[PDB]
Amino acid sequence: QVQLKQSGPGLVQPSQSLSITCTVSGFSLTNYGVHWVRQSPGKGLEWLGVIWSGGNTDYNTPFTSRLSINKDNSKSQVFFKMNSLQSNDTAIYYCARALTYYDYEFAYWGQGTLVTVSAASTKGPSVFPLAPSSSGGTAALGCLVKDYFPEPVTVSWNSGALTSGVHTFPAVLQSSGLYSLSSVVTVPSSSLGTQTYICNVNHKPSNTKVDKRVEPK
Amino acid sequence: DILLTQSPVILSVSPGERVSFSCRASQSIGTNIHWYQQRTNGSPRLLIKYASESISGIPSRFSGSGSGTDFTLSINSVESEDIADYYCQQNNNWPTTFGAGTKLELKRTVAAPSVFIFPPSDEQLKSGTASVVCLLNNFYPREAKVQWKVDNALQSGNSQESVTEQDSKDSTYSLSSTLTLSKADYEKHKVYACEVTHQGLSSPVTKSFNRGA
C-alpha cells in the first residue's frame, strides 16, 4: 500500500544544514504532492512546506530563506534540506501525503526523523543485562542501554517475536550529557530454561547494533 | 496565522464513557478542519477530515461536528486503545496550522505494582560504574514513590525515574528507578533495598539483595 519511509535519525551541529530523504511507494510522485511537517517542544505541529506533483514548492513564511525541497520522480525520492539550524530546530520531522493531490488532509505520514541540534559527539551505548533471579511464576528481565548520544535507540526482543509484556521506558538524560534507558519484559519463570531472551539494541547515529542475551545469573 | 485553541489540555475518562474534544479557531474557518490521533512514539493518524467526514479504517465511534469557530471531536464509547493525544488542523487560511492538542487519559481500577530489583551486572562493574534498577510493573494510578537504601542509608539525588505512558490494553503504568553509584561505592556496601509506596499497597513493598548473594 501507500508508504513513506524517511532516512535515519541524525545529529546536526549548530548553524549547519539538515538533510532528509523521503522515499515513497504505493503511488507516483507525479500524481501527489509531498508535505513536510515537524513537531518541536516549543511549537508542536508545524507545517514547513510542500513539493507538488509538477515540481512547484511552497515554503511556510519563517522557512522561505533556509528551506529547500527537491525530488526525483523516477526514484520516488523527495529531498528535504534546511539550513543554519539552531537548538530550537530540534524536533521530529515528518514527510506526509494528503488524500488528494491538491489538498492538505494528511492521511499518510513517514515514521519521522528525530533531529538533534548539538555540538556534542555521537556516542554508541553499552548494553547490560537486567538478570532475573528468585513473582508467582513470573520473572522479570531486561536490558540497560546506557551512555549514548544522541537519541533515539530502538529495542526489540527476540527479533520482534516477543512483544507481550515488553516495556521500553523513555530515555532519561544523565548529568554527563548522555542518554540512558531500560527495556523490560515479564515472562514465565519456567520458560527461562527452554527459551532464549535477546534484546536487539540499535543506535543508528553511531552504527551500534548489539544483541544482548539475558540469562539468570 | 490562525490560532487554534484546544480544550481541555487533559481529558480523563473511564472506558465506555463519552468524551468530546474542543477546537476553537481565532476566526471563522467554516468546516475546513481535520482531526488527528497520535499514540506514543507514533505519527499523526487522520481521524476526521472537514469537521465531520469519515476516514477509511477509522472506528465508527470517532465522529466530529462544528462549524465557524467551534468544533468538536467525539468518541461515543471510548476504549483503552484510544489513549493518545488528539490534534485539530485548520486549512481555511494559508498556512495550515495545528492546535496544541489534548491528552486523553483513561481511568481504571487501582492496580498494585509488581516490584523487581536488579543488581548491576558484572559486565558494567568493569566500566567503573554500578547501576541498580528497581522495576514497578503494571500499576495504577501513576503516583508512586521509590526509596533507595544502602546499608540502611537513605539515598538521595543519585537516582532517576522513568515512567511509561498508559498501556493501550490494561491502561496501567510501569516505572523504572535507576540508582547509580561508583564501583568503589558499590563494593563498600552490602544491602541494596528498594522500597515502593503506592495506593494499591496497604504497606510499602521492599525488594532487596546483598552484593554477592
Partner: peptide, 12 residues
C-alpha cells in the same frame, strides 16, 4: 502542554 521528544506525547 509541551511535546516531549522522548515519547512523541504531550507532557505539561
Amino acid at each position: 502542554g509541551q511535546x516531549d521528544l522522548s515519547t512523541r506525547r504531550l507532557k505539561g
